[PDB]
Amino acid sequence: AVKYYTLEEIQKHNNSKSTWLILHYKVYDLTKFLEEHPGGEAVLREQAGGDATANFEDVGHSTDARELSKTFIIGELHPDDR
């Protein structure tokens, strides 16, 4: 099965308690990854609650980075909001 979230729900997760963002229609919970991110936590908090796909691809993340990102997926963006 798969859990779907709306943009309205995702937008709420951008505080000190929770940080979610969207990448390629998938929802990632990066709350506990903030301090481990090689690119820093500031670049993640700025995109929190929205779609960061372009910025993610813009810096050109490596294969290892993409493989690791999969562990943070909690669902997908609801089809109606795509």
Ligand code: HEM
């Ligand atoms: C899905 C979560 C993400 C993971 C697992 C992740 C992981 C990493 C890793 C492992 C690196 C080191 C270089 C590499 O291996 O490519 C990196 C660098 C970087 N990341 Fe991310 N990243 C994520 C999301 C993002 C997002 C959404 C942004 C921007 C909006 C971002 C901005 C950067 C920046 C600025 C660097 C530095 C690149 C450089 O110095 O060339 N990352 N990230």
